[PDB]
Amino acid sequence: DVVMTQTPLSLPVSLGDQASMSCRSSQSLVHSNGNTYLHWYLQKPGQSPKLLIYKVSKRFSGVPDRFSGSGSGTDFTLKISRVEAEDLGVYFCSQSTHVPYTFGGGTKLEMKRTDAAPTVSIFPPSSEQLTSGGASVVCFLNNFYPKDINVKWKIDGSERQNGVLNSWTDQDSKDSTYSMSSTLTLTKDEYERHNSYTCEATHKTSTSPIVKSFNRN
Amino acid sequence: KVTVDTVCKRGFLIQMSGHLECKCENDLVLVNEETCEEKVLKCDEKTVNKPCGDFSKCIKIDGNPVSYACKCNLGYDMVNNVCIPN
Amino acid sequence: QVQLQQSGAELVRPGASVTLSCKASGYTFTDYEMHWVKQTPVHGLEWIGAIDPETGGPAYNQKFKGKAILTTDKSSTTAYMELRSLTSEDSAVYYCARYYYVSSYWGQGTSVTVSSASTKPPSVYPLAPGSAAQTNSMVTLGCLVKGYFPEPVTVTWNSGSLSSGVHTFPAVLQSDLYTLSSSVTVPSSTWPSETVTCNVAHPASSTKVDKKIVPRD
Numbered sequence: 001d002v003v004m005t006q007t008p009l010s011l012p013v014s015l016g017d018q019a020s021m022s023c024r025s026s027q028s029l030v031h032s033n034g035n036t037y038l039h040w041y042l043q044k045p046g047q048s049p050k051l052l053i054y055k056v057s058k059r060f061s062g063v064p065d066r067f068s069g070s071g072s073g074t075d076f077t078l079k080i081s082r083v084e085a086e087d088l089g090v091y092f093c094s095q096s097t098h099v100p101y102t103f104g105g106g107t108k109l110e111m112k113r114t115d116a117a118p119t120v121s122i123f124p125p126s127s128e129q130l131t132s133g134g135a136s137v138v139c140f141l142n143n144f145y146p147k148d149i150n151v152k153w154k155i156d157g158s159e160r161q162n163g164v165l166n167s168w169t170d171q172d173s174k175d176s177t178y179s180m181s182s183t184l185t186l187t188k189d190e191y192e193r194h195n196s197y198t199c200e201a202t203h204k205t206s207t208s209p210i211v212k213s214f215n216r217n
Numbered sequence: 218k219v220t221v222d223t224v225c226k227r228g229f230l231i232q233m234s235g236h237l238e239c240k241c242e243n244d245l246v247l248v249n250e251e252t253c254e255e256k257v258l259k260c261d262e263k264t265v266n267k268p269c270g271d272f273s274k275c276i277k278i279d280g281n282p283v284s285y286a287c288k289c290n291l292g293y294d295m296v297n298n299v300c301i302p303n
Numbered sequence: 304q305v306q307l308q309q310s311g312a313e314l315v316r317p318g319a320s321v322t323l324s325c326k327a328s329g330y331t332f333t334d335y336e337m338h339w340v341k342q343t344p345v346h347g348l349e350w351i352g353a354i355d356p357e358t359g360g361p362a363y364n365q366k367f368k369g370k371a372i373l374t375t376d377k378s379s380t381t382a383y384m385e386l387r388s389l390t391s392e393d394s395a396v397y398y399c400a401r402y403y404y405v406s407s408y409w410g411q412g413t414s415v416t417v418s419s420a421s422t423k424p425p426s427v428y429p430l431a432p433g434s435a436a437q438t439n440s441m442v443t444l445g446c447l448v449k450g451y452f453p454e455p456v457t458v459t460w461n462s463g464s465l466s467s468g469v470h471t472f473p474a475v476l477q478s479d480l481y482t483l484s485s486s487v488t489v490p491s492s493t494w495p496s497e498t499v500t501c502n503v504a505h506p507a508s509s510t511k512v513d514k515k516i517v518p519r520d
Binding site: 035037039047048050051054055092094100102103104105121122123126128129138166168179183214 | 338347348349350362364365366398402404405406407408409410411412426428429430431432433441443445447449470472473474475477482483484486488
């Protein structure tokens with residue numbers, strides 16, 4: 001199979017910037033008919049991918065002329081001359097020279113802004129839940145930038161991976177930040193056998209973990 | 218022979234110059250009045266009889282070292298490498 | 304104009320099969336192949352196979368041989384994909400697309416969710432701070448909405464009067480059931496002196512729940 005690799009995974013830009021993305025193939029995409037079947041798509045959230053450029057550099061009907069593609073053999077490049085708000089989304093390249101047809105992993109074009117440290121909030125089980133035998137501790141990590149973030153749960157100091165459910169928001173359309181929710185679910189039994197519950201965030205804005213804790217006491 | 222009831226294959230009717238024509242979608246080429254197909258860029262054994270341009274197809278020419286060429290259909294002259302009615 | 308109308312969202316028990324449809328209109332059906340493509344967050348875009356509607360002949364990505372079966376019906380200009388013996392790996396969005404050297408038009412996509420659950424209302428748990436908030440500070444409250452099926456649940460705060468400072472996190476399916484959480488952030492001068500309530504609706508079970516967030520004691 002031909003593997004398609006796209007760089008970068010995330011392209012933060014400000015409106016009006018130029019943008020450039022790379023797509024490389026593991027095998028030449030020149031077809032025996034002379035053509036090169038390398039195409040670019042834009043996919044916005046909740047929608048299907050839409051064709052932008054086909055056969056390396058041909059603009060699909062109706063596509064704004066700020067998009068241009070170039071390249072040859074294995075290396076290809078999509079450029080956006082001046083980024084607009086409607087351009088944010090995930091850009092996929094794909095080849096239809098070789099069966100099976102394959103796609104790259106996508107480059108996500110996103111809004112750049114200044115760094116923002118997450119607001120971390122931790123919440124113990126409600127009494128409603130505890131009467132059922134289950135216990136969930138919830139940690140929100142809200143309105144942070146950049147998007148990269150790591151969350152570790154600690155029970156009395158011991159790192160715990162089982163029982164953790166995580167969910168991420170898309171980039172906020174007003175302040176360009178990201179947010180995260182992390183839920184650690186236990187039995188009431190195990191929950192009452194421990195004291196310190198701690199949500200620890202690793203993010204660019206602090207060199208040490210950002211820590212919210214709750215003591216059952 | 219293009220009329221209001223012609224169905225343009227991978228193309229569409231448009232008034233160009235005086236009357237109706239099938240214009241190809243994307244970068245396809247005319248293989249006849251009402252048929253648009255993919256344009257190969259090389260004429261060799263792997264593309265024989267395939268479209269190489271509007272009203273042009275890759276042909277195999279029988280001489281010694283067998284050769285291939287993009288030849289216009291009957292009724293057209295390759296003028297500066299573009300088929301145009303004779 | 305050219306239209307590819309895919310069938311609605313599917314909820315499928317593990318081991319069952321389901322058949323997806325792609326109704327083509329606005330072009331000559333037999334002039335283009337139909338491709339089907341799978342999309343997941345983990346594995347990205349994957350070409351499933353192609354079918355020539357003039358002959359019904361399919362060609363398959365080796366990865367999906369035996370998992371997918373492509374047919375076409377000329378009279379109705381519809382392409383079908385049958386997925387067989389579904390596992391959790393088959394949960395995805397599935398697209399059909401019109402292809403002639405490039406896929407210029409795509410369907411809107413079909414959501415397939417594999418789960419053994421029947422319709423099930425959520426449990427709705429308040430998330431309230433453990434400690435009182437300082438003067439002129441922000442307070443983050445929340446609601447945990449867990450153990451439901453299928454999507455969607457909706458969440459609002461104070462019947463939608465609290466809209467800024469809200470983060471509703473996308474639902475996550477785990478062990479056949481969805482979990483979702485939502486946070487809201489308000490000045491300490493507004494809560495708990497004014498009431499804050501998350502309103503949860505699950506239309507599939509005709510469930511509507513209001514959960515006032517009360518301070519912990």
